[PDB]
Every structure is written in C-alpha cells, then in structure tokens.
Design a protein around this ligand. Structure first.
Ligand code: 1F3
Ligand code: MG
Ligand code: MG
Ligand code: MG
Ligand code: MG
Ligand code: MG
Ligand code: MG
Ligand code: MG
Ligand code: MG
Ligand code: MG
Ligand code: MG
Ligand code: MG
Lengths: 240, 58
RNA sequence: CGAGCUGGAGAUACGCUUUGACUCGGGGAUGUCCGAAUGGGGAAACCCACCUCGUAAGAGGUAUCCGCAAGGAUGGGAACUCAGGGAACUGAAACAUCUCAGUACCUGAAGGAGAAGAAAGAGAAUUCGAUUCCGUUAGUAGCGGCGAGCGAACCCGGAU
RNA sequence: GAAACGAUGACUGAAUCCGCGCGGACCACCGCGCAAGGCUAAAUACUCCCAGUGACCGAUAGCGCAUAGUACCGUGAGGG
RNA sequence: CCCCCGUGACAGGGGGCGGAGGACCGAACCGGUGCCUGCUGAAACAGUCUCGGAUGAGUUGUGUUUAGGAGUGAAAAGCU
RNA sequence: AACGAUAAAAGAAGUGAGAAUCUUCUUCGCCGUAAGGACAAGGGUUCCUGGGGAAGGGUCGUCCGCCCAGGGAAAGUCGGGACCUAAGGUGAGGCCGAACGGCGCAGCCGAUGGACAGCAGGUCAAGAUUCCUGCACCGAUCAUGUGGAGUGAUGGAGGGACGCAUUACGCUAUCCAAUGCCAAGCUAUGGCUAUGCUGGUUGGUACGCUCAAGGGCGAUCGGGUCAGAAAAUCUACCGGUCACAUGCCUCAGACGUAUCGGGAGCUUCCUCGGAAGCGAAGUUGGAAACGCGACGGUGCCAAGAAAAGCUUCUAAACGUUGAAACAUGAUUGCCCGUACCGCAAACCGACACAGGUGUCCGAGUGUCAAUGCACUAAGGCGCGCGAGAGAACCCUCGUUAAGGAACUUUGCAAUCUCACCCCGUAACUUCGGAAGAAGGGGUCCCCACGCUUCGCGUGGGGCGCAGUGAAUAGGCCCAGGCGACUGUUUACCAAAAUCACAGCACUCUGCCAACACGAACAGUGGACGUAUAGGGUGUGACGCCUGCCCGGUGCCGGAAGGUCAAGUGGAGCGGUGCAAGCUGCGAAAUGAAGCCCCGGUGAACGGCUAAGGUAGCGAAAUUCCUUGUCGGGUAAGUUCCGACCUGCACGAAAGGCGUAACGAUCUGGGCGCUGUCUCAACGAGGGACUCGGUGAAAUU
C-alpha cells in the first residue's frame, strides 16, 4: 500500500455520454508510473516490491534508485524483489533495463516502447504483450508490435527488456454479471433489441437483422476506418 | 362517469308533490299540574321538575 | 402666495403659522443597502478584508477596457433607425424552383431621431446637377415551374 | 437568361490625362462621369411622457385594472 | 491451514478448523405477484390480505452534471 | 350520497345565553421499534398569556393549528462564517468562434467530507452545552517571574490518509434479581401480618503508592549527492552499532477519599392549586452494545478522496543588552442560526386528505434468537357528527350435516400445512445440489437423580378434548414448454418466454487510435488507457455440435482495359473596326477518387436461378387440413404426455439439440384440504333503514 493521486470517475465529456456504457466500479486511486525513465540514466535501482495496481492489467514494480527517489515501473514477466536495474545507453540488455533500440539486439523481446524520444512508453503496456526487435535500418529500427504489424521506430526511442507481467488474463473468467460491474456498466445493449428511432437495427416484429451497421450510420465487419496520413511512411505491412 | 343520472329536470309541480308528506307534527303539549308551564306526556315537567313529586333540580 | 396648515386617512393627541407657515416655481445640501455594480466573496439587498487620513466615532480609496494624462467607455430605454444572422405555417387548390419574406424572431450598435449624402451618377435631351421624403409615372417596362404570382426607374409636380 | 453594372469568400492582380469608368453580351462611333479618403444641418419615422380635441367607450363597454400586474395559478419562463 | 486412511491409469475420502456466497429464512428498507375493495375514491394509481428482493448488478441523503429531433434508457418509443 | 379507517366509551362535577362535543375528576379502551421521544429538511409565529366567537372546523362549540392584542427566542466552547478542500462551478493571462458566446492552467467559489475549546445541575406561562449556580477549557493582547539565547516561510519532508467481511479480550451506556439497604403506611374479601405489598437504590469534578484488559512505540553515529528547485540539523536510500520475551509510553474503565449535584419522599402556606424549605439509602450477584479501549486480530479483491490545521526542516529576515517556551495574574470574547411543528391537522400532496418524507434513541415479561409476535412501562392517543334499530342487498369476518373440485376458462378464492428438537428422506445431477424432499414422532405441570448454563437428559407421577394450549407460523408431489442462473422492464391495464447477464464469435483500431460530443486547426470523452487494450455488431451458462450455395447485394483485394470532373490545351468557328486590335463560342489529347469488369468472402445481408437440408428435432410458443393416427391417463380426455412423419410453412451463433439447479413464468396430472360447488344456513361487525345536526353530484 503506497503513495499516488486520485483518479475520479467520469464517462461523458464537457457535456453528454460520448463513450457508450462505462459507469460502475470500485474507487481506485491513480499510481504515477515511470514511462520515460530518461532522467534516471546511470543510476541503479533495487526492486523494492511488485504491487496490485488497478487502472492497468499489468503488474507494477516499486523501484528505488540509490539517490533516494522511489518510482513505480511496469513490472515485467520474470522480475523479482532485490534484482537491481539501471537505465541509459550505458546499460545491459537484462530484465527491466531501459535502453534505446540501437543498443537493443535483434530478436530480443521488449515492452514499454516509445514512439518519439522523450514522451514515454506507448507500445506493449498490457500484461503479456511484447515487441520483438526485427532488425536495424537507418536511424530507425523495424519491430513486431503485439498486433503483428511491423513499424519503423527510430532507434533513439527507449524500451524495457522482457515481456510485460501479469502472466495471463485467462484463469480470470469473470463468472457473474457484476464482476463486469466491479469495473464497467452494463455493456453491449443490442441495437436489435432497440426501436427504429433509437438505432438502425431496431424494430420489426420479433428477433431479426438487415444490412449490418453501428449505433450511428457506418458498417462494422470489415471497413477500413484508418485515415490517409503521414505515419503510413514509418509503417510496413498492416493486416492483423 | 356518474352511471344512473336524471333524464329531465323535475317540474316545480312534481318536486312539490313529493313534498306532501314532509310537514312536521306539532307536539301534543299538556298543561302542567303544579307550575302549569307546558310538558310532554310521560316526561318530567321542564319548569318545576315534577312527576307527581319533584324529581329534578330547579 | 396671502391664512391657513398639521400626506391619501376620513382618527385622537401635540403643535406650527402675517418676525409670512401650507402650497406652487427654481436651485442647493443630505441620500443606508442591492443593482453596470466597480475591493474580494456571494444563493441581490448580505458576508469578509486591506490602505490612507483620523480624537474613538467616523470620512475617503481599492473592477476591467482606451489612452502621457486630461477625459472617455461598460448598464438602462415603449416604439422608430441601421447592421450581423435569419424561419415555418401559408399560397402555388398536391410539391421541390418560386411564394409567405429578408416578414417573425435572436443578436450588435446608436440617437432624439436615424439612415443616406456632394456623381467613376441618372439617361438619350450633347437635358439634369448630393441625399431623404410625398404625389405621379404605373400594375407601365420588366420578372416568373412565363404558373401562383412579383413588380421598377427616368420625365414631370411638391416638402426641404 | 443574350445578363451588363454593383458587391466579395478563394485565386490572380492594370493603366496615370494622345490616361481611366460607365452607357444591359460584345465591337466601332457618338455621349455622360474623375473610384480605390473623411465630415455634414433640413424635410422623414416613432410615441414612455405632456397638452388639446372626438356623429370614441361609459362598468360583461373602455386599457388587463374607475387601478392590479394585485389576489390567485405555475418549479419556472409565464399566465391572470 | 493442521492432522487420519488409500494406491491397482484413477481421483479422493475422514476428522478438526476456518468463516466464503449477485447462498438460504426473515424484519426494518426497497418492490408490486394474485384476489377482493375503492371506481363523483381516504387517494388524479391507493387499501387490507397475499407475494419478490433482503451483503448486493443493494438501498438512501445532501451537492452537482446532461433537455427538445435533444437528453437519458439492464430497451417499453420508457422517462424527461 | 356523504360527514375521511370498526382504536370505544361511560358517568359525575364545573362553566356558560346556549354544552354529546370546552374544563376537571374517576373508570374504560387503543399504540408502545410507536400511534413514545430527539433532530434535519421544509414551514413561518402556527410557540406562551389574556381575550374573541363572523367566517374557517365535514356536526356543535363556551374550544382550536382560526380572529385580535401583548410577550417569548439570550452561545468564545453547539451548527455555519471570519479555516480546508471533492464533484461541480468559475477563471487575469492563454486557446476557439457570424454576433450573443464556447473552452481553459494556476488561483478562487463550492460540504454532503477534514479541522477545532464545556461538562453537571437549576429554572419563565413560553429559551437553554445559549440565562443563573458550581467548577473547568481554548486562542489572542498585555503586566510579573523563571529562561538565559534564537525564532524557524509563500518553499521541502513527515502527518492528516480513509476498503469490504469476519472476529479475540476488557469495559461502559443500559437491563434484571434478591429475606442487601433506605423510606412510607396499610392492610380486612378465606388467608398473610412480613421472609407481605409499594417506591427509590448515585451523576460532574478533584486528588489518590489501589485493581486493570487492551492499545502505541525502535534509538544513535555515519556515507553518496546522483533524490526532495536551492538549502536543511528534516526526509528518502545503503551501511555500522544494542533491537527474542521483555522493555518503555498511554490508562477504556473499575475502586478509595473528598466535594458539588441530584435523589424516594417528607414539610409549611395557599387567592384551588402551585410556590418555597428539608432530604433517606447508595449493597451483593447476573446480563450487556452497533458505543468506548483502539489506527486491535485475521481474511479477501473489485484494491478503498483532497486540502488545510498539525509535527519537523532549512531560504530570506530581524537577533544575540531585552529569545522561544513555561508558570501566575489581568484583559478580551465578532456575524448568522437557536420559539413552535417536524412519519405530520403546522413539510409535499387544492382539503384538519388512510399516500409520501433523510437520520437518531426506542424500556419490561414471555417466546432458540430478534428492532418478529402477544400483553404491557414511560409516554401518547380514542382518529371533530351523534343517537336508535337489528329488513332486502353490499362489504370485512366466524362456524358449518352429508358429500369433497362434482365449481370453473382455470381449485380463481378460501381452507389445509405452519415454530423449534429427534428420526427419516427418492429420481436425477454440473457432484454443490435437488432437501424443509417425501414421511414419522416429540412438545404442558410436578417430583427425584444426573449434568455445560437461560437450561437440558433419564426416570416416576399428574390434569384437560386439546400442551409452538392464545399471537407470529411452508401444503406437498409427478410430468412437460420457455428462459441456464441472481438481476431488469412498460411511474398509472403487460414482470414475461422481454432486456441484461457470465461465456462465444465476426470485425475495426499502432495512438493527436478507431469512435463520439462540438460554432471550432478550440476543447473533451475513449484513456492519465496502448492490441492479453479500446470501439461496434451478433449470439447468450454448460455439454455435444454448427452443414450446403459467393449468382444478386454489401465488404476486402486486383487493375490490362472501357467510362469519368474542374483544370491544363487551344486547333477550328463567328461578331465588330479602314486597321492594329478588342471580342462571342470553342474540338482532339491529357486529367482523380467513384462505377462497369476480375477474384475472394457466411458466427457478411441472405438462400435451401449460385445451390436445393449435414447432424439433430418434428402435428412443435412453428401443423392449414385437424379433435391427424395409435398408445398412456379418465367412467368419459378438442387439452396434456409418448410414439409415428404427410415438416401447408423446423434446422444449426435471425444458433440446432440437450441439460442438473433456479422461476410471484406458462401447461397437464396426482395426494391433501376445503362453502368453489350440490345448496345453502346460522351467527357477527360496518353500511344500507329511522330521528336530530350539516348537506354535495353528474344530468336536465
Ligand atoms: C373507471 C371510470 C372510467 O371508466 C372506465 O375506465 C370504464 C372501464 C370504461 O369502460 C369501458 O371501456 N368499457 C365499458 C363497456 C365496454 C368497455 C370495455 C370494453 C372492453 C373491455 N375489455 C376487457 C376484456 O377488459 C373492457 C371494457 C369507460 C366507461 C369508457 O367508456 C367506454 O368507451 C368505449 C370506448 C365505448 C363504450 N361504449 C360507448 C360502448 C364506453 O362505455 C371510457 C373510454 O373510459 C375509459 C369512457 C370515457 C368517458 C372516460 O374516460 C371516463 C371519463 C372514464 N375516465 C375515468 O377516470 O372515469 C371513467 C368513467
Ligand atoms: Mg350598471
Ligand atoms: Mg398596470
Ligand atoms: Mg416472506
Ligand atoms: Mg421465497
Ligand atoms: Mg476546472
Ligand atoms: Mg350509527
Ligand atoms: Mg319501532
Ligand atoms: Mg422433449
Ligand atoms: Mg429468466
Ligand atoms: Mg427472478
Ligand atoms: Mg338526517
């Protein structure tokens, strides 16, 4: 049980319900996690403890850097209490060390991957997710992201050795409605159980369906929702 | 609404005709034997309070 | 002004008045607190401060936007004026262009009025000579699912 | 529309007085004007307020009120 | 968790002990199943009886947020 | 018609013009986890006193929550402000926008949370942690004395700081018992003569070597600067040195002593009922919190506000000759709230309305327990018409010969069953269940003995028709449909087979994500998340499974070609001028996404021409003919179960088939019981009828 900030609940924007469903669940305080790790380069840290920290799905390791500054870090699958850890270019590719992709070997499994130097971790953060290094290009490294997509991440971006913790959300089977409620409000309200007024599927006389669409107009099974943007150049082979 | 209801106003005649039996019957007042102020038969005289002798106060 | 007055109040008491009450004109001096509201806060009319002078009582100051400053501005107006924005019912015996109509409404700015105004003009006389307003031209010319229907201007006569 | 002229959001972007704009595509000729700077009384519109008048009303009329935006209704706008 | 018995592809089974649950019965409390009553009501939706939930996807105060083709909706075109 | 719950009333005495209705006495009855008491909201003088008696009061009033007049409301410590922050609101500067305006960091506003000093009594007609009395406490300012030096932000750190369940030990509030104590008297009906009866039986504070559960704590010297912006003697980290039990520190509460208080009652006066004075006893034993000790123990996952006050640090600063802190005086003590009603005749419901309204306290006896049920304390109340009668009929009830579902759409309704203890208990199953299955027996009183008590066990005896002797109080079972389950819904005719659900799938989205709100290159939600995540669609636990058709439509993918817009391109055609020229119109070619066209795709829309049903089910919530046909059950079976197949018109995530358990679901059967019924009777209460009082309505 250790220090953090309060994460007050909210399911609607500066007015009305914008992200559908979302509502119940326990109180939960926000724990500040170290995603950047750069300002602690060269300083060694000891894994004080791993902790149950909601807001995440992935475990959290309580780190103590020899200077006195205690920081929380995404605990990776394998990290134990007492195991030392360091950040920077001058840092070994060992369990829990933060080092840019240029110093990171090929085929070597990583997580907490950035996208722009500084900013912080943005890829493979959930438990069990990992990015595997494919092979260095120019001032960019090709990687295999959790989805299966290949991205050009510029070598200068930090990473953490190993796959993310919390083994597997598998034996977690919820079981009863209300385990869902311990977290988020009655989800999936069928649009076919709605009225012509309410949603496009809604209406008719009994059980049905006729054209396949979401809440508003669109269509959902197979329809490229992606834009014709810049980031497409720093990307290779999408599908799955 | 108010299920059975009257079909026509009942005339000034008709209304008064059913009234033929409403006329009150005046008491059969008798003179009192010992204070003379009238009394009801079989009742105690209200004035002297007698019923052969004086039964009630005042 | 010239004997009354003491508000409607018609009610008793106290009184005031020709050393001119009362009422009528016209200027002053007071003018709590809220309100643009303006020290800060606020569920108007209440709560809480700081500065300066001051014998305590008490008096003055503490909003933002223009500009050296002087000095100006915020808010309020029944309708009328111009501007930004701008419907539908309705009519077309249905309706979509069209109509209703740049009407209703909202919003901004302002005044006792405003707007507009001193020809890169009107129009065919090598006439006129800033603008507005009224008459008339004239239901003309024209517009128009060339349908419903819409509808000028010059000339000339006047207000100025 | 044969649709000129004004105006202008986007893109362009001239001449300087043997110059420039217009005269209902457009060209010639004839004719009327000086843009891209500003100010401006008066006649005109209205009626919160005041006065005067009326083939206007006179208490179910006339303003909603012979005075009340009250009583009363409504959470409120509002209605009365 | 601590002890007792078993082995032939089997697991377990016994005692203690602990104190789990959209677990059970049931009041407060939330609710509205069936009948009657009530239908110019005691009441513009109720009453007596009976009945569902009753540690949960629970109930409830204050404060605050979302509204008009708009909100909200464990979804009746419900509620506003 | 009604006069607003069937919780009653009776009499006497008084008052008055007038009395069922106002007052007083004595009874009666009703509530008593309330129908008693204390708040909050809300109301606004309704509060108390004296007077009134037109209207209001469902009747009458002499009375009132009504009408008039007067009065009453007292705070340094209680609640709020002069303190703090949450959601939210606002917001100089800053980001957007036809206007109006929309956002938005710090800051500020905002309690429903944090923080913080007073306890016991007394008493107006009407106030009390507010006034009075007794004794405290808090901050500030100053005077005195001790101290003899530091004080220590707007900044740092520590602290405030927070769940759900269960539970060990001590306690108190509080409650019971008695031949404990104290007080008052008396009783008699037959007795008792007190070992009977009734009542009371200790709060505040101070001091105390007295008993005390439970709770809380490491101390110090160092090292790195790379951590807290900087500094720190503070805090974090690493290290060295004594950290078992103990050891410190605090004492819920009890006990003793003293003192102020209260205390059953007793007493004197009385203008009829108050005022004043006095004042006994303080035991032993039991029970006991949701309160206190306390931030205790354990277990669990869904992982449990912030900020100030507070404590510790240094920066700046004034300073060491007059410090901070302690101690004893004195002085000081702002604003608003405070009456009264407050589960209701004072609030919301037009009404003195059978409804609604957040928190707290809520006694005794009996009953495993309890805030249940019955009676009852304290306390409150009899519900603002009354009186007769004892018809029809209507309502709420009690009993019922013989029969027992024959009632009927349907056992609708109403019975039966009913608590606790012992015995006992089926198919089926997901191994938990089904289960309170089903069924049987016990239950009171006394005495003896045994024991863990309020008690319970064995034995013997007693009484009644009957012993959870009254109240609270499951009827049960067989089979089927649907839905797995708890849950949700049509406020006011539908609670369900609807919606949701755990689980499954298709699919989209690489992060300024897809998507969504929006004037908007604003801002925001998704998300302080990041593909073991988020959006959308569908199916709907679990088990076995989920087939064939890609022609049309949609989606993804191809591009060799056909089509295809603005623009580029200006060949050519024409107007006018004497002309240079200025102008109207203007092909070919080239020019993007889209469409034609090719292939894929089914838990894509769909079908059973692109193919004609794989299992499984089938007269079905699907079957027209139809009461299909045979079987079951019945005396008799349009329904129901079972087969069969001729499926008008089943069929595999618009899921197919099954499934233990669950259900105010729907269907058929059985046992039980019964006024549903043959077939109705008697009895009760409230109305209906009668008199007095008040007196509506739709309709015409
Ligand atoms: C309870 C009192 C209220 O009356 C009511 O509700 C009762 C039940 C309704 O009766 C009826 O529906 N039935 C009576 C006979 C058949 C019918 C009926 C038919 C089928 C079923 N089916 C099942 C299987 O159950 C049930 C009933 C009333 C009488 C309705 O009148 C009937 O309308 C039919 C359309 C035409 C009928 N005639 C003309 C042939 C006519 O009689 C109605 C519409 O009111 C609903 C009238 C208006 C005036 C109102 O609204 C008043 C103000 C009501 N409002 C209020 O509050 O008081 C009320 C009087
Ligand atoms: Mg008259
Ligand atoms: Mg007026
Ligand atoms: Mg029950
Ligand atoms: Mg039940
Ligand atoms: Mg904010
Ligand atoms: Mg009677
Ligand atoms: Mg008789
Ligand atoms: Mg079957
Ligand atoms: Mg169900
Ligand atoms: Mg249910
Ligand atoms: Mg009568």
């Amino acid at each position: 049980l250790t220090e953090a900030l309060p994460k007050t609940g909210g399911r609607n924007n500066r007015g009305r319900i914008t992200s559908r469903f979302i509502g119940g669940g326990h109180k939960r305080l926000y724990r500040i996690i170290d995603f950047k790790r750069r300002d602690k380069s060269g300083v060694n840290a000891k894994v004080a403890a791993i902790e149950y920290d909601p807001n995440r799905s992935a475990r959290i390791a309580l780190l103590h850097y020899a200077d006195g500054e205690k920081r929380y870090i995404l605990a990776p699958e394998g990290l134990t209490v007492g195991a030392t850890v360091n950040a920077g270019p001058e840092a070994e590719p060992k369990l829990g060390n933060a080092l840019p992709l240029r110093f990171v070997p090929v085929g070597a499994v990583v997580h907490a991957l950035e996208l722009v130097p500084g900013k912080g971790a943005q890829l493979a953060r959930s438990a069990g997710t990992s990015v595997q290094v494919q092979g260095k290009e120019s001032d960019y490294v090709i990687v295999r992201l959790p989805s299966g997509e290949l991205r050009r991440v510029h070598s200068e971006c930090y990473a953490t050795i190993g796959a993310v913790g919390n083994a597997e959300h598998k034996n977690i089977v919820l079981g009863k409605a209300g385990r869902s409620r311990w977290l988020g409000r009655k989800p999936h309200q069928r649009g076919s159980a709605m009225n012509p007024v309410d949603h496009p599927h809604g209406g008719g006389e009994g059980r049905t369906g006729a054209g396949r669409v979401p809440v508003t107009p669109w269509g959902k099974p197979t329809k490229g929702l992606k834009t014709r943007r810049k980031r497409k150049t720093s990307d290779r082979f999408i599908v799955t | 609404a108010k299920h059975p209801v009257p079909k026509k106003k009942t005339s000034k005649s008709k209304r008064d005709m059913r009234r033929s039996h409403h006329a009150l019957t005046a008491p059969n007042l008798t003179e009192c034997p010992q204070c003379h102020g009238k009394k009801l038969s079989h009742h105690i005289c209200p004035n002297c309070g007698y019923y052969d002798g004086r039964q009630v106060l005042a």
